[PDB]
Design a protein around this ligand. Structure first.
Ligand SMILES: C[C@@H](O)CN1CCN(CC(=O)O)CCN(CC(=O)O)CCN(CC(=O)O)CC1
Ligand SMILES: C[C@@H](O)CN1CCN(CC(=O)O)CCN(CC(=O)O)CCN(CC(=O)O)CC1
Ligand SMILES: C[C@@H](O)CN1CCN(CC(=O)O)CCN(CC(=O)O)CCN(CC(=O)O)CC1
Ligand SMILES: C[C@@H](O)CN1CCN(CC(=O)O)CCN(CC(=O)O)CCN(CC(=O)O)CC1
Ligand SMILES: [Yb+3]
Ligand SMILES: [Yb+3]
Ligand SMILES: [Yb+3]
Ligand SMILES: [Yb+3]
Ligand SMILES: [Yb+3]
Ligand SMILES: [Yb+3]
Ligand SMILES: [Yb+3]
Ligand SMILES: [Yb+3]
Ligand SMILES: [Yb+3]
Ligand SMILES: [Yb+3]
Ligand SMILES: [Yb+3]
Ligand SMILES: [Yb+3]
Ligand SMILES: [Yb+3]
Ligand SMILES: [Yb+3]
Ligand SMILES: [Yb+3]
Ligand SMILES: [Yb+3]
Ligand SMILES: [Yb+3]
Ligand SMILES: [Yb+3]
Ligand SMILES: [Yb+3]
Ligand SMILES: [Yb+3]
Ligand SMILES: [Yb+3]
Ligand SMILES: [Yb+3]
Ligand SMILES: [Yb+3]
Ligand SMILES: [Yb+3]
Lengths: 177, 181, 181, 177, 179, 179
């Protein structure tokens, strides 16, 4: 089976109010050893947010702002990009690359189950031993249509026909790990 | 209930396409149905939603002169794509969009596709002209009260600085009701 | 004449607004006329065209919760804005748009505003599905002929490498006509 | 009067074919001492393009590509952003900041008149001695409407009325250099 | 201490290197065994610059496309040259260098010797910025406010309200720069 | 010469500095008199990093908004720390450092001494990349192709077609890296 986000996520996830200071955030991250805090929703409809080590370094430290006067609402992402627990890790990897984030809460319904990061992916993903190309199932469909057309046009016993079907088979082998 | 939600302003006519379709098939569907975005069908329970938009097609195919009859949707779609909760307030959708630099997203609840929401939807149907509320003002109010409580403890409960800090709490609270009205 | 031009696919209904108007006035006009972009009127002969678009309004006003009744168009417009020649081929418009990361621009000839052209206009009305031509293929052909001429001079006019280099010139020239048809 | 692009542009502008090699481009730039070449339109409808020192350094030198095999069409901007000769330099400065370019051809109709750059602006603009805020005329209109409203509401002889008109006057003074 | 905290005082000292010719699988294996979010790429000779490959390079460039780490090589995804950090550089400057260049980690180099590796985590966990916040370029602000003050006093007189005001700006700033 | 051309061989040697506390007008005046597209910002002390302010900083951040250069200061628009260049660094690496960090000019620093200033123009006008083009990290490619070659020969025999093929890859690459 495809390895899922919830199988590699960090389960220790702490939350903080958006009204807290950045100093409060930094203290919590130091005590708990955390590179990201989830911002508590204030009510059922209110979205999840996140504040991360990079937010704090780029937006506070890099200008020399006083973390005791800045607040989490001034530097958090809210709404933040979120991850389904069933989502395959290769998709998380990609969501992360496309949106340029390194971590996200894992949410199922409106319940917070954990937090998943690039480090989680590097350290616990099966991607070295089971690399599987994204959208391969869509590739398989397309390569079958191509193969069917080449064989109709050039003949069932032509080198180009046999080549096109070989593509269908290398892909199907690749999709079954 | 009070804040206008994504589902109240989304476009409900949402069409999907397979990732294996050609870009030409995508363009034909968008022209027939008059659509600036197609949702890519999930292949199974776990598989995420994706999107292909007018800009994907123009920037990745038209601008190079690629043949839409040989490219496929999987070559230019975003998958996973950023998604929007139906309960999310429109001011938050506006912000999600600004932070992620997108102009449209599917509205998804659980794994069910309810619609599609865009910057146009926001411009044409949001209540932001008549009910403007600054984002996180409620968090500002909490912080200004903590600041005020600290300044009064430090400088004395009858000090000009104490009364000033509470006046900031009150200008903010006036601002938060003026618009909750 | 052969290549489909910007003016043949542009939207002709183009409305303008003053830079001094409020964002609320802009939003009202866009809603009445159903428009995703307003052109900002030049104040005099030399003054450039500007644009304010649905995204400017959503990203700069809605996403922060600013009051559109107190902000002004000059605070969120692009001026000068990128402009499009009416004679420009649509594949070039597609590319200008990709390189500059915009989705719409006024079509201007001299200082006269003829219309407005967008990615939607391109998606819905461009001939790129049926007449795909790779950009700068004609420049590729010239370069491949220079390469071919050099390889033949260096390795001999009857050499496999000479005949191969000219075969590249011919596959390209076949590709450039297949679509000029 | 507002200083215009054509008054500060470089008039020595050389062109090159898009089919030329990057080595040809580099040779021409070295002989003529130029940080940008205009790409010749091939016919009346064909847009102007540009290739600049940065294109060459970022796209060829930084990867170690052979300038003798790469071509100008592979690294040029075409269409390129263009400048009207009548456009005020403060607007050129801004067009440049918004589009993140440092140079553009000056075109009137379809005739190439010159080339204008950030250096041209730094060295020949009047911006140190006559800095003029962009869209001030639009600001003036808005400040008059504000002033008219405050005086109607609070009275013609109120401090807030006199303050609002003082804004109208500081702006009008600023717009006349 | 009262001095500005320096990069070398907060850097991670356990720094491992890899050749640019190694596979990404070799890189991933090393990072897993040693528990590391970044490897320094060995310079091949005196002139050759340092490089870096990081957890994000690997996830964004290899995992997210489904490339085979056993066939890709570190030279295909590393930054070389990479941005490098002086050991004497103040952490608030490292924070800024990081923001301006959009990186999250860099080698600490003195001459051509590798001393360690410094990251945003190092900054979050070990910087003194909570207890000693100092605005960037306040020292430059102080110099400018002194030049302004000197000029106003020369022009308007050394005992003038405007002179005393301008020096009061110099003093509020100097108080802000210390503690 | 045959060696890789270094930053110090193509840098501009006329390099002027300015304090961060100076006005942008002072900066503009200096750049006009000396004919310069960039000024180096003086470090205030041993630990303090180098900075830079460039023609683009001034045009994009001051001119384009209509700010008064007589009231703005260099610290409000400079990069500090700025990316810096070793004098021994090869120009193809400078070109790359520039692309990766999105800058067009940098100081050349050896230790804490300022030797000059190097820019994209310097690279365009004085680089040997037309006559000596070398692909970046080809040396790393060569190392990898030798490891591959060594393995194929150990596995399949030293006289096997596959062995001779793998070494032929090593030789085409080595020819490409020279002349
Ligand atoms: C309300 C103010 O008093 C602010 N308060 C800080 C606010 N936060 C979170 C929050 O209460 O929203 C920390 C919660 N904590 C215990 C608790 O209150 O539940 C702190 C106790 N005190 C005083 C008090 O609360 O009685 C410190 C000041
Ligand atoms: C610390 C701040 O609270 C200062 N406080 C002013 C000083 N005092 C009493 C005191 O608080 O020592 C006045 C009494 N009064 C109600 C009350 O305090 O019970 C004030 C109401 N507010 C808000 C609030 O009280 O929460 C104003 C701020
Ligand atoms: C056509 C080929 O011959 C290529 N040609 C290079 C092309 N360019 C520009 C161009 O001609 O499009 C340089 C022009 N120049 C004089 C001229 O031709 O007008 C070169 C002369 N020769 C031979 C020749 O042209 O007769 C060199 C090879
Ligand atoms: C240098 C290349 O031009 C080689 N050339 C092949 C060698 N020879 C003659 C020769 O060119 O020495 C064949 C004669 N023939 C027409 C002619 O050359 O006049 C070829 C047509 N083409 C294109 C072209 O000729 O422009 C093929 C390329
Ligand atoms: Yb079969
Ligand atoms: Yb179906
Ligand atoms: Yb329409
Ligand atoms: Yb690709
Ligand atoms: Yb109180
Ligand atoms: Yb206010
Ligand atoms: Yb009018
Ligand atoms: Yb519509
Ligand atoms: Yb502003
Ligand atoms: Yb010939
Ligand atoms: Yb082909
Ligand atoms: Yb009057
Ligand atoms: Yb860990
Ligand atoms: Yb030595
Ligand atoms: Yb050591
Ligand atoms: Yb650690
Ligand atoms: Yb002064
Ligand atoms: Yb004194
Ligand atoms: Yb010059
Ligand atoms: Yb020393
Ligand atoms: Yb000197
Ligand atoms: Yb020069
Ligand atoms: Yb192998
Ligand atoms: Yb041998």
């Amino acid at each position: 089976m495809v390895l899922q986000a919830q199988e590699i996520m960090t389960q220790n996830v702490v939350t903080i109010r958006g009204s807290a200071t950045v100093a409060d955030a930094v203290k919590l991250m130091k005590e708990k050893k955390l590179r990201g805090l989830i911002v508590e929703p204030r009510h059922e409809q209110d979205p999840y947010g996140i504040v991360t080590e990079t937010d704090i370094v780029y937006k506070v430290a890099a200008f020399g702002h006083d973390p005791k006067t800045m607040r989490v609402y001034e530097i958090m992402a809210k709404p933040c990009v979120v991850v389904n627990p069933e989502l395959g890790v290769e998709y998380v990897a990609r969501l992360f690359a496309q949106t340029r984030i390194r971590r996200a809460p894992v949410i199922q319904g409106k319940t917070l189950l954990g937090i998943i990061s690039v480090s989680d992916i590097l350290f616990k993903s099966d991607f070295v031993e089971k690399p599987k190309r994204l959208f391969i199932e869509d590739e398989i469909e397309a390569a079958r249509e191509d193969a069917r057309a080449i064989c109709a046009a050039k003949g069932e016993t032509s080198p180009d026909c046999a080549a096109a079907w070989d593509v269908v088979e290398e892909l199907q082998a690749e999709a079954s790990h």
